[PDB]
Design a protein around this ligand. Structure first.
Ligand SMILES: O=C1C[C@@H](C(=O)O)NC(=O)N1
Ligand SMILES: [Zn+2]
Ligand SMILES: [Zn+2]
Ligand SMILES: [Zn+2]
Ligand SMILES: [Zn+2]
Length: 362
């Protein structure tokens, strides 16, 4: 007997188009999403060109409309030049992304004052998410309080970070967060197997104590999100390995394994991959959309999953229980047992749906 799940949402993916399409493109990345039981993705802005201005957003929107197989929203990225310039297009984006740690010259912010300027100028009803590690979590929380608004913390990876967020929630502060599967299912213990190139990711893999703290503090985690960050094996294994792991095709099987072991409940999973993504980002329902999973099927993750152009995975060799059998997206069969059955361009920008605009005061 299969279990019917709603259409799951991944609020943190890197689909590499424009400009990095040997790593992934909208068509391959959304195939990966569908095969992972994900029917809606929010794509990050660190493409080439980066999505830091209205022309780049317009290009990315058209590339996504033409290539995506599942539905999507596109983030804008904060830069050192664009605060106060995004007001006309802000509501068309998933939200604003701040890269507050090591990043590219185009997305780099050199001063906390620039963070403040973004918090002050970005429309106050629209989402802001941050790559903010270690003390940066506390720093961006301070900026959010100074500017009297919410913030969402991407890929929480450390005991330190989850406990800081827990303390902030205990004080009633408007902060939410997400955790990626590699920070729940991999640790320093895996670095020997992965090697130093494949093992490169930001935030880095944590200690066993970090992993245990995330599980212990599941109540603090609002969302799961993959941080799908595909790079080719040649890049990961070469002289200057870029950080990141592909993860769309493995996230749900890993989490279903944990459900089957009683580490979290089915409801806990659906809050974190469906209801909380919807409510934090004001993402609309998808009509006639669902995912059928087989919870009994035991398998071992292979050296690469079928769809991502990354063509490698750090979870190779892990034994999992649970698999996606069928996905229906807006009344059409999108995926069955290893075959994607909707073409590039079937997917739509959810921010253009009437129900997909973020409500605001006039
Ligand atoms: O912050 C980031 C971005 C990402 C990428 O490759 O785009 N990969 C990572 O590991 N961390
Ligand atoms: Zn990040
Ligand atoms: Zn994120
Ligand atoms: Zn990311
Ligand atoms: Zn529900």
């Amino acid at each position: 007997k299969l279990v019917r799940l709603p259409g799951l949402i991944d609020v943190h993916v890197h689909l590499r188009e424009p400009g990095g399409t040997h790593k992934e493109d909208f068509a391959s990345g959304t195939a990966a999403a569908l095969a992972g039981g994900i029917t809606m993705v929010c794509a990050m802005p660190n493409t080439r060109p980066p999505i830091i201005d209205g022309p780049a957003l317009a290009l990315a929107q058209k590339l996504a409309e033409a290539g995506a197989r599942c539905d999507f929203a596109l983030f804008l990225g904060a830069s050192s030049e664009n605060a106060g310039t995004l007001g006309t297009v802000a509501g068309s984006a998933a939200g604003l992304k701040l890269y507050l740690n090591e990043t590219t010259s185009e997305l780099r912010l050199d001063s906390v004052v620039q963070w403040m300027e973004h918090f002050e100028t970005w429309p106050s009803h629209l989402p802001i998410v941050a790559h903010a590690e270690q003390q940066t979590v506390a720093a961006v929380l301070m900026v959010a309080q100074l500017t009297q608004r919410s913030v969402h913390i991407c890929h929480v990876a450390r005991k330190e970070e989850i406990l800081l967020i827990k303390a902030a929630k205990a004080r009633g502060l408007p902060v939410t967060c997400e955790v990626a599967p590699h920070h729940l299912f991999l640790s320093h213990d895996d670095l020997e197997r992965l090697g130093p190139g494949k093992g490169e990711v930001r935030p880095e893999l944590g200690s066993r104590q970090d992993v245990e703290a995330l599980w212990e503090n599941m109540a603090v985690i609002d969302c799961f999100a993959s941080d799908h960050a595909p790079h080719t094996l040649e890049e990961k294994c070469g002289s200057r390995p870029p950080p990141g792991f592909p993860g769309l095709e493995t996230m749900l099987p890993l989490l279903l394994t944990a459900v089957s072991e009683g580490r979290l409940s089915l409801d806990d999973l659906l809050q974190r991959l469906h209801h909380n993504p919807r409510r934090i980002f004001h993402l609309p329902p998808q009509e006639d959309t669902y995912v059928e999973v087989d919870l009994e099927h035991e398998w071992t993750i292979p050296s690469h999953m079928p769809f991502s152009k990354a063509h490698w995975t750090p979870f190779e060799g892990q034994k999992v229980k649970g698999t996606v059998r069928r996905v229906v997206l807006r009344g059409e069969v999108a995926y069955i047992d290893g075959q994607v059955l909707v073409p590039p361009g079937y997917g739509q920008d959810v921010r253009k749906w009437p129900q997909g605009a973020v409500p605001q005061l006039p």
